Amino acid sequence: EHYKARPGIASVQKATESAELPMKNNDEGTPDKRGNTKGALVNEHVEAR
Amino acid sequence: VALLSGKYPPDLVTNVWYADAIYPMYADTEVFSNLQRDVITCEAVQTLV
Amino acid sequence: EVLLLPIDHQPANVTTPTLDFTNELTNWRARVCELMKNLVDNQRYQPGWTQSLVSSMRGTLGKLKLIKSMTPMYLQQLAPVELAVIAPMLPFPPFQVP
Amino acid sequence: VLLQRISPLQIDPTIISNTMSTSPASSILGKLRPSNSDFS
Amino acid sequence: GYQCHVCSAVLFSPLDLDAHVASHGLNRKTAQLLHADTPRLVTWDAGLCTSFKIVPIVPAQVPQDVLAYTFFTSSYAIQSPFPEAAVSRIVVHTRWASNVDFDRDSSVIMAPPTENNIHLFKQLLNTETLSVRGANPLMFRANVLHMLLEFVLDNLYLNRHTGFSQDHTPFTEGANLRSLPGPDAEKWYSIMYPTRMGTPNVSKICNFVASCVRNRVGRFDRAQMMNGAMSEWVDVFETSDALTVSIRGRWMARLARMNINPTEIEWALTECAQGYVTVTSPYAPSVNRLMPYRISNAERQISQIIRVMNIGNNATVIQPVLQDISVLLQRISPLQIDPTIISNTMSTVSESTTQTLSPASSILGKLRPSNSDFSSFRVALAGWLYNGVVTTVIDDSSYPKDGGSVTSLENLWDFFILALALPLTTDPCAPVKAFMTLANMMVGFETIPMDNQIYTQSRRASAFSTPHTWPRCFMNIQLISPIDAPILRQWAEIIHRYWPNPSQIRYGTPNVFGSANLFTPPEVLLLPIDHQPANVTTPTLDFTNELTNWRARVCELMKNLVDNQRYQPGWTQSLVSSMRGTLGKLKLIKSMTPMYLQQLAPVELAVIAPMLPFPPFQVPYVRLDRDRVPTMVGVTRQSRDTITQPALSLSTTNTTVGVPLALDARAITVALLSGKYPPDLVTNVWYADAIYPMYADTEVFSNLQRDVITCEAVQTLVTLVAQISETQYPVDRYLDWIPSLRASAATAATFAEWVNTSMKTAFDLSDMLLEPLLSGDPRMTQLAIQYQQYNGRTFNVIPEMPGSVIADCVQLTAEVFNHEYNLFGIARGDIIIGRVQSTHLWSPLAPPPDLVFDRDTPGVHIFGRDCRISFGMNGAAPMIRDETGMMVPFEGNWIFPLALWQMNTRYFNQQFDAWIKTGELRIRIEMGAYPYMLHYYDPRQYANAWNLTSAWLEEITPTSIPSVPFMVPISSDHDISSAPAVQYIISTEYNDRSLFCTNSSSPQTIAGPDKHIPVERYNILTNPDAPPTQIQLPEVVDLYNVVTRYAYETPPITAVVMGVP
Ligand SMILES: [Zn+2]
16 A cells, blocks of 8 residues: 555545435425325415525 | 635646546446436336326 | 536646736736726825825735736636536536526 | 545635735735635 | 932832932834844865765675785775775765864765665655655656755855875875864875875775876965965865865855955945044055955845835834934934924013913914924934835824814914925925915815816815826916915915925945945935035024025915905904014024034935945935826836746836835924024034944945845746746756656745755845745746836836856756766666576676667567557457557567556556566666666575565555666676576666776776776876866866865954044
8 A cells, every 4th residue: 555545535535425416306396195285385485485 | 815816736747636536536426327217217208298 | 518618718737827818817817906006096086095005005906916826727727627527427417508 | 525625726815915914905804814714 | 119228218119219319319024124144155164175975885805715815905904095895886975074164054965875865856845755765756856956956055165274294204205285173184194195005006996096196196386475374375186076176166256256355445434434434454465354245236236126025015114214213313413402492482472461362372282392303303304215115294193173274373373383394204295285285274265276076175185195186276376366366376386486406415335335226326315305515514503595495485474374454354463463473483493403404414314324224215306397206116026928028027017115104293393493503513523423333333244245145046046946947047957857747836836945945044044035036926037126207107127137156056066967967876767677587797787788679679669648458368368559559468678658657557567567577578667867776796696686676666656666776796806606697677878887996905806897996087196198277077077186275364344444433
């Protein structure tokens, strides 16, 4: 083990582990198995704020 | 202030720094799984419509 | 096979001088400092300054114009290379509008 | 985060202080605050 | 506090008790601007001037059996000039044979080549190298440059004369042999004189010395000037080498250019005193002093520009200088302020008690005569020397609150306080403020046309600070109509008519000193006020100068103001009488301050102005011409992208320098109105007593010594940076063959700081030098200065760069290194990692040309940036991709660049090392320069190189290589047996130059690499037709020369030049 990594493998890989993460799901507004639209009851613009 | 300041290390060679920064990043690739998921995302649309 | 950028890019070398005005960001910093020097120069637009701050203001603008900084050298040479390396490996590949 | 971990650029704000070496000159050192290291 | 002991009286609070006893009785820039460090120029060396020693490596076989022990001169303890050994190298140790008084903490110390010298090449830019034996082959050039700079900055000494003998022995008859001091000297007389030893033998040293010449030994020249004193300089034949003899010779010439005699010190100090202080110099034959103090004017100008760049604005660096000059004027000036003059002359003013104003008593509450007038008046006088940097202005607070009105008596006096103080400032916008204060006193009473709605009449007069704000009604007096503004018309005429005139006083002694001023001619100063010379030496009161005219005309304007029909009936008649009486009283007040400032203060300024740590810096005092008002002054330190010419890249690259400064107009007015003399003084006795004690200082000479180091360091920096990066100045480059990295900004900025530290340590400097040159980009450096008038007419000064012997000697040592690379532990060329197994005894630093190959050799495959390796399936051989698209097996001759191995070191080790050992293929790895390490094996036994070469090949890292090992056979004298030896790493070119002599006591060398003692070095002995003062400098080093040895002495200047008190 003569050569050590100049940016550092343990530093680059720990950021690539969270670049690997997929996009968070957005579920509200869509119906469930019964038929009810899931999510909270709120004004849409108040929710977007 | 990030524009007005900032410097390189006083010993960098780009063919060392980038060859050492690319490899752990590509070692945690997920492109072959994303390309394998996009076919299913494309294929669900016909079975919906 | 294109990646739209709002900055001009040049091929990468590290031996380019820090005070080239071919680099458009360094040119932009220089022109803003020259415009502010013309703004301060003749003491109109600033009545009520009791002392003569024109020499000191012009000197501290000249230092900020002639500061050494490798960030405008970086953004046109090595930042688009790193963006082009990173971009096809992203989980949400880039969505650009011209 | 990943651009900061890959990039060679070391952003330290002390170049401004070494250039100024301290009025209008100290006012920009008040406005820029080079005691900070938050560059997100 | 208890009790005094004169009378038994008890008190409290010892602030009372000490008065009771008296009644019984009666950062960095501030430091460097005043007390800059003094460099150590002159340093003596009583030892012999060499830097190359001869170290033995392997011992000779003194108890051998082929030849008896009585053959050897080691059996008799005979001291020899060269170490007897089987193999002896020459290595580099600066000052192994020296004896100095003040060491320079910089030296090049090398181990012998059997040990490891990698710590001299991993020193500079290797902060990310893991192993303690590896160094980056991209920083070899910067490492070698820093080693050469250390090598010169060590050897900058002077040769010292010690003493001599006469040889009583018949060795070298009648010669005068040097005796160098130290703990012993017996081991030195063989090393110094190789030709002194007798020659009984057919040993190689005795073949040499018997071949040498005889009459060139010891001392052969001297300059004996006096009986019973030192000889001045001698010439000795002794062991030295031409390179450090050349360095110390050029340094001796550089110091001898600066020399001054005791007579010109007298001629300089007499003119600097301008006749008041007379010093003397002896008139006799003397002994050859050395006083290095004369420098050219270009060095003074460059050191002036760097100080002005230090006093880029900062507002506090130059304030202690003005404080120091005020305190210095205190100890000289015979003018003393007397605040009782005004309190006397305002007593007898006739006025009524029934009035409620008292104009004679309002002005004493305005003035408040106190003690601190001096330290606000002499700062205003000291600011006349520094027009270019300091712009002294009247305080913001000394103006009235709302502008005031002329009906206000207190504002009427507050105008009078400013009208006297404003001619003594140094801002160019003083007369417009003097006009605008009265135009603020009169709003509504009478009006004049202005320029805009912004800078109208009712603006505060402090704001008119630039030439653009000067109103058209002031610059053209006809616009003020005398019908409805007669007092402003009259005050404008008084300003345009009776404002003082600039002049010139001629300080300076440009013979010994150098005129450090720019923007002016040398030997001249510029004053704001006109001056006359003193005719009589018994001074007495008169009323004829510009300051008394200026005091009179303001009072007469105020009398014409109180004599106004629009203004007089608002006041009572006794009050008008008292105000007019106070003005007529205040016209003719006796004060010696105007006559002082006219005709006796510029003499003090011209006397003081050379004896000064920060020499003056002025732009021309223009009186009222708006065309030539200086609006800026700017210095540069770098250029733009392309322009290599300062006259073109100066106007767009500068830093504006200059800071304002506040003053007290009330204190200046009190100091002007109240000044008296000693009651019967004579103004030559006063000055011959006062100026005398401060002319035994040496700071005015030591700053001239300092400016040499300041000017030569920037030239050494701009020379040494140009090797590793491109610049604008034309230099030669001798070290392109050593591989270097591609220089960014941070590489040059780091390398320049290491050069700064290597100067600052070696010349005994504790403060900071060339730091503003380090703040910017140090690649493209230039030094220039300019100032600009109002109309855009710019006056630039670009001082030339005189040559620096430090950079001259660094380039000389580079030229010598180009032929003596083998001495500093570097080989030139590249290596071959084939397999050679034979019983031959050729040395791998000088291989036979059968084994090497090149790009021109046919059938040789060349590998570049492309490496694709196909594996060998089903018994077929694996292949690698040629540069020209071919696939070749693992045979033949290959050529690699070193970086190709470095980027793929572990993948190449597992593929290639099994084939280099037992198969056949050769790999020529090219790098240009590499450090080498040696291993001496015995040629009668088996040897193998694999445990060394595999250990070298495994440790190649993408950022470092270790030093390259070799295996050299030990050259025995007598007949030996033969054994197989397996060599792997051979060199390409000749690298066996550091070898000195083989077996050194035997008659010959039968088997092994041999060489005799190099005749081409010892030219002066072996060539009878050569002149003694001959060097062959770029090719050889010659190891034995004539050297001059001085016996000068360096006394302080007050120990030679004495002044009569
Ligand atoms: Zn007492």
